[PDB]
Enzyme design. Structure first.
Site, short mmCIF file in Angstrom:
data_model
loop_
_atom_site.label_atom_id
_atom_site.label_comp_id
_atom_site.label_asym_id
_atom_site.label_seq_id
_atom_site.Cartn_x
_atom_site.Cartn_y
_atom_site.Cartn_z
N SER A 1 0.74 -1.19 0.02
CA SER A 1 -0.04 -0.02 -0.17
C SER A 1 0.83 1.37 -0.02
O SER A 1 1.56 1.29 -1.04
CB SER A 1 -0.95 0.02 1.23
OG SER A 1 -1.78 1.00 1.05
N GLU B 1 -9.59 -4.03 -3.27
CA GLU B 1 -8.77 -3.04 -2.49
C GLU B 1 -9.77 -1.88 -2.02
O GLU B 1 -9.22 -1.27 -0.98
CB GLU B 1 -8.03 -2.36 -3.91
CG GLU B 1 -6.95 -3.39 -4.34
CD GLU B 1 -5.80 -3.50 -3.67
OE1 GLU B 1 -5.90 -2.65 -2.52
OE2 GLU B 1 -4.90 -4.30 -3.77
N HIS C 1 -7.66 -4.37 1.17
CA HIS C 1 -6.21 -4.49 1.26
C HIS C 1 -5.46 -4.48 2.55
O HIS C 1 -6.07 -3.84 3.40
CB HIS C 1 -5.66 -3.31 0.40
CG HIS C 1 -6.03 -1.93 0.81
ND1 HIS C 1 -6.95 -1.42 -0.18
CD2 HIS C 1 -5.74 -1.40 1.66
CE1 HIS C 1 -7.17 -0.05 0.31
NE2 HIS C 1 -6.45 -0.15 1.70
#
Ligand SMILES: O/N=C/c1cccc[n+]1CCCCCCC[n+]1ccccc1/C=N/O
Ligand SMILES: O/N=C/c1cccc[n+]1CCCCCCC[n+]1ccccc1/C=N/O
Lengths: 535, 533
Positions: A203, A327, A440
Site C-alpha cells: 500500500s 482494494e 487491502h
C-alpha cells in the site's frame, strides 16, 4: 558479554546488538528488533532528512520493538481487531527510526536474500512492529533475512515545504532509504546478502517501494521489489510540490504557525498536535487521500511517478506487483456515507454518486459522471449491492488496481520483469464484514506466514497457502522469479507483459493465470480519465 | 377480369394482379397512386392527394422508384443491387402497393404498412425483399408499402419556407397512411388495425409517425427495425437542413422562394449528383437529406419528443440486427471492404471512429475509442474491425434503439425488442459483417418461403416464426402466439428488466440489457461529453 546466547550477539556499523531468540512454529529465529538506523529525528531534526545513527557504546538491546513513529491512531472501531491490528503496538515517539531484522537461527551460514518490508498506512501510519509484519515465519520457514524499518509518517515523515532546507519533504522515504543503506552496510552481519535485497511493501509501503525504484539513490540499495496494493504513481501516493507546500502551510496555520520561521514554529509544536491537525489539510472530502505523502520534490522524485514510470529504464528490475480482490472496500467505511463494517452497506444510487465524489475527490463533475457511468450496472442501476460493490471497485480501481496496472504496464514495457498477481483469498479470520471481500492489507498476514502460527486459528488450507505465498515471495527475492524452480508440476506464474497482461490469482486454488488486470476499466482510469481532466 | 383483382378505392377503380405465393394466390395491387406526382412545381412540396381517375387503373406492376442516388459501390453485386432501384427512377413515384390474401379477407384483417429504409436518400417499396406476397399469403396480412420521396426530393427543407418545408417524404408516408385509412377497407384491410413497420430510415420514419400527432391517428402499432427517429442520423435541425439545402443549391447554381424555384428547375440527377456533397464531415451512416426538426411534423427533436411523449396506448416492436454497423463501414471507412476480411489497424480504427462518429470531438472520439478497444488485444485487427462495426451500429442504431425502447417503455408504450442474429445463408456480403442491417427484412417478409430462393429449410421455418411475430404483433400488439406455449414467451421490453429476445434459428432466448453498458455510454455519457466539448 558472558552468559548470553552467542547467536544473538551481532555487531553492526553503529555497534553491538543483542537480539532475541524467537519461537516460530518450525523452530527458533533470531530477531534483532529496534536497531536504530538514524539519529532520533527529534527537536530540530523534525522534518529533516534522517541522519545516520551515531555509533553507540556497549551492547544495544535489540530484543524488543522500538517506538512507532508518531502517527494518527485509528479509532473508527475501538477494540475492533480489524482496525486495531494496524494501530501502533508500541509507544508513539518521534524517536522511532528503528528497524528490525529477523534471520534464521542459527544465522545463515551463507549470505541469504534479504527481504526488506516497508509497511503501509497511507503515509500517516504504520509500524514495522505490527503482528502482521512479523518476520519470524519468513525467517524460520524460508530462511529469509527480513528487515523492516520504521519510517516517519504523517507530517513528521512528509510535511514538505518544497525547496526549503528545514522541511525538504520525503524524509520518511529518506528514513526508508537510510534503512536500506543500513542493510547494505550491516545486513551481512546477520547472514543477509546485501547483494540480494528485495523491497516489499503494501500500500503506502508499496508506493514507497515504487518510489525507491524511481529514485536513483535508492536504486543501488536493492535489486528486486514487490509492490502490494500500492504504487508510486496514482492519485494518492504523491502530491505536487505546490500541493505539499499548500498542505504544510495550512497545517502550520492550523497549529498556530519564509519557510524557516514556519518550520521552526512547527518544530515547537508537540507531535500530537501535528497529528491532531494533519487530517484537516486535505483539499476535498476524500477517502484514500492522505495529507502528508511523498512530494514530487524534483529531488527524491525527480519528476512525477507517472513521468518516471512512462520514461524510466527498468532493464535490471524484477518487480512483483499485485492487488487484493477488494482494494476499495476497506476505504469505504472511513467516510463514505452509507458504508459500515456493521451492516452490509447496501447503498443507494445517490450514496453511490456521493461516494464517487469522495472516492475520486479530484474528479470534475464530468469525470465523476464518467466514473458513475462506467461503474453503474445499467441493467440494475439502483441495485444497492451492486452500487456498494461498484463503490468498492471505483475506489479500489482508482487507487490501487489501475495504478498497479499502469505500473505493471509501464514497467513491463520498459524492460522490467514484472510478475502481477491478484490476491483473492479472504482470510478465514477476517473480522471485516463479508461484503468487504479481501480488503487491502489482508494478504500481508499470508505473505508473512502468520497462518503458520497454529495459535492464530487459520485453516490448514491457509497454512499451506501462506507457505505457497512465502515461497513465491522469497523465490522472487532469491531469483527475481516467484516460481518454484524445483517443483514445476505447479502451474507457472508467467511474467506480466504489455502484450499478454498475464497475472495470477492467489487463492486457495493452484495458480490460475488470468489476462488483463481490469483491462477495460483501467483503460478508463489510466488513459481516458486523465484526458477528461484535460477539459 | 378476375373480380378479386378489382377494387374500387376512393379515387376510382383499380385492377390488381393475381400473384402466386408458394402456398397460394395473393391479390397484389401495385403502383396505386396515393398522391399527385410531386413533379415540377410540386417538387419539395407536401404531397397533394391523388385526384380521382377514370376507368380501371392498372395496379399490376410496381410503379417508379422515387428519384434517388443509385448505389454504384459494388456494381452487379447482389448485396448492393438488392437495395438498388428495381424500377425506373422518377420523381413521379408516389405510389403504394397493397398485397391482400386471395380471395380477399372476408373480415377486416390487420394491415402492415412497410416503410422502406435507404437513409432517406434511397429505397423503393418495390424491392424484392419488400415483397408482400408471403405475409399476405401465409398470414392473411394486408401488406401495404408506399414509395415516399427520398433525398432532396423528400427531405430538402428550407424550414419556414412555403415551398420546401421539409419532411415531405414523411408526408408522403403520412399520405399513404391516410390512403390506407380511407381505402384499405376496400381491400379487406382493417383501417382500425394498422401496424407501421420499417427498417432503418423506414424505422426512423415509423418512429417519426409515432412522434407526429397527425400520423398517430393513422396507425395503432409500430415496428422499428434497426432505426429510430432519435439518434445521430434520422433528423437534422432546421438550421442544418437550411444549411444543406442552401449548400446543395449553391452546388447546382442557385431568399427561399427563388432558391427553391431555381432548384425546382433542376434535372433530378443534378440534385442527386450533389446530394452527397452537403454532409458537414466525412461521415458514414449520415445522410444529406433526412427529416428535419421543423417544429411542424416534428414539434421538437425526436430526443425531446421521446423523452416527454405519452405513449400509453402504443405497442412498439423494436430491434436491431447483430451487426448493425458492419454494412456501413465499406462505404467510406478506410480499410473496409466486402472483399478482404477488413482486418484494420489501430490507426484505421481511430480514423474510422472520427468517420463513424462524425459529430465527435477529439475527446468524445477518444472516449469511443477507449470504450471499444478490447484493451486485452488492443491492436488485434479482428477486434478493431469488429469494434468499428460495433461503434457504428451502436452509435447509430443499437443505442438509439435502446434509448427509444427505454423511453417508450417508460412513457407507457408496450415495447417488444429483439436482436436479429441469424445471417441469411444466402448473404452475399462477407462473413465479418455478420448480420448487417437490412438482412432481417427478407426473413420478416417471408422470402425464405419461396423455395426458389435457396434459403435452408431452417430459415423457412424461421421466416415463418418471424412472420408470425410481426403479424401477431400486427394483430394484437403482442408478437407472441396466443396459440403456442413455453416457447419461451417474448416478454415486453421494460426499463426495469430490459428484456429482449434473440431472433435467430434457435428458439427465442430472452436477454436483458440491449448493450446496456455501451448504450449508457452512447446515450448518457457521450451527450455530456459533447455538451462541454
Ligand atoms: O491522519 N488522519 C486522521 C483522520 C482523522 C479523522 C478521520 C480519518 N482520518 C484518517 C484515517 C483514515 C483511515 C483510512 C484507512 C485506515 N487503515 C488503517 C490501516 C490499514 C488499513 C486502513 C484502511 N484501508 O482502507
Ligand atoms: O446521396 N448520395 C450518396 C452517395 C453518393 C456517392 C457516393 C456515395 N454515396 C453514399 C452511399 C450510400 C450510403 C451507404 C448505404 C448503402 N446501403 C444502401 C442500401 C441498403 C443498405 C446500405 C448500407 N447500409 O449500411
Amino acid at each position: 558479554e558472558g552468559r548470553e546466547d552467542p547467536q544473538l550477539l551481532v555487531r553492526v556499523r553503529g555497534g553491538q546488538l543483542r537480539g532475541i531468540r524467537l519461537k516460530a512454529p518450525g523452530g527458533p529465529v533470531s530477531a534483532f528488533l529496534g536497531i536504530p538506523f538514524a539519529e532520533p529525528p527529534v527537536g530540530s531534526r523534525r522534518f529533516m532528512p534522517p541522519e545516520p545513527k551515531r555509533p553507540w557504546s556497549g551492547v544495544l538491546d535489540a530484543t524488543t520493538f522500538q517506538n512507532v513513529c508518531y502517527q494518527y491512531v485509528d479509532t473508527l472501531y475501538p477494540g475492533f481487531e480489524g482496525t486495531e491490528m494496524w494501530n501502533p503496538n508500541r509507544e508513539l515517539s518521534e524517536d522511532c527510526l528503528y528497524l528490525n531484522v529477523w534471520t534464521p537461527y542459527p544465522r545463515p551460514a551463507s549470505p541469504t536474500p534479504v527481504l526488506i518490508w516497508i509497511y503501509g498506512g497511507g503515509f500517516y501510519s504504520g509500524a514495522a512492529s505490527l503482528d502482521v509484519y512479523d518476520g519470524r515465519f519468513l525467517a524460520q520457514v524460508e530462511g529469509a533475512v527480513l528487515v523492516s524499518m520504521n519510517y516517519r509518517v504523517g507530517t513528521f515523515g512528509f510535511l514538505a515545504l518544497p525547496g526549503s532546507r528545514e522541511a525538504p519533504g520525503n524524509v520518511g522515504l529518506l528514513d526508508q532509504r537510510l534503512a536500506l543503506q543500513w542493510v547494505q552496510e550491516n545486513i551481512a552481519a546477520f547472514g543477509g546478502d546485501p547483494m540480494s535485497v528485495t523491497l516489499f511493501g503494501e500500500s503506502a509501503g508499496a508506493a514507497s517501494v515504487g518510489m525507491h525504484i524511481l529514485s536513483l539513490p535508492s536504486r543501488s540499495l536493492f535489486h528486486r521489489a514487490v509492490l502490494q496494493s500500492g504504487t508510486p504513481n496514482g492519485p494518492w501516493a504523491t502530491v505536487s510540490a505546490g500541493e505539499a507546500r499548500r498542505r504544510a502551510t495550512l497545517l502550520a496555520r492550523l497549529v498556530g504557525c519564509n519557510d524557516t520561521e514556519l518550520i521552526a514554529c512547527l518544530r515547537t509544536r508537540p507531535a500530537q498536535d501535528l497529528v491532531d491537525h494533519e487530517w484537516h489539510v486535505l483539499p476535498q472530502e476524500s477517502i484514500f487521500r492522505f495529507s502528508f505523502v511523498p512530494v514530487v520534490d524534483g529531488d527524491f522524485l525527480s519528476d512525477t511517478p507517472e513521468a518516471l514510470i512512462n520514461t524510466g529504464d527498468f532493464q535490471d528490475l524484477q518487480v512483483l506487483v499485485g492487488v487484493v480482490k477488494d482494494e476499495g472496500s476497506y476505504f469505504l467505511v472511513y467516510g463514505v456515507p452509507g458504508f459500515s463494517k456493521d451492516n452490509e452497506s447496501l447503498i443507494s444510487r445517490a450514496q453511490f454518486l456521493a461516494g464517487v465524489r469522495i472516492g475520486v475527490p479530484q474528479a470534475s463533475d464530468l469525470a465523476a459522471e464518467a466514473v458513475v457511468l462506467h461503474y453503474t450496472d445499467w441493467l440494475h442501476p439502483e441495485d444497492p449491492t451492486h452500487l456498494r460493490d461498484a463503490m468498492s471497485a471505483v475506489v479500489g480501481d482508482h487507487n490501487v488496481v489501475c495504478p498497479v496496472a499502469q505500473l505493471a504496464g509501464r514497467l513491463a514495457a520498459q524492460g522490467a520483469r514484472v510478475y502481477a498477481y491478484i490476491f483473492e483469498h479472504r482470510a478465514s479470520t477476517l473480522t471485516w464484514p463479508l461484503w468487504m471481500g479481501v480488503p487491502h492489507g489482508y494478504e500481508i498476514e499470508f505473505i508473512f506466514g502468520l497462518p503458520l502460527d497454529p495459535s492464530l486459528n487459520y485453516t490448514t488450507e491457509e497454512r499451506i497457502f501462506a507457505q505457497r505465498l512465502m515461497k513465491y515471495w522469497t523465490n522472487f527475492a532469491r531469483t527475481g522469479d516467484p516460481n518454484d524452480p524445483r517443483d514445476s508440476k505447479s502451474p507457472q506464474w508467467p511474467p506480466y507483459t504489455t502484450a499478454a497482461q498475464q497475472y495470477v490469482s492467489l487463492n486457495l486454488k493452484p495458480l490460475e493465470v488470468r489476462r488483463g488486470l481490469r483491462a477495460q476499466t483501467c483503460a478508463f482510469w489510466n488513459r481516458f480519465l486523465p484526458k477528461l481532466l484535460s477539459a
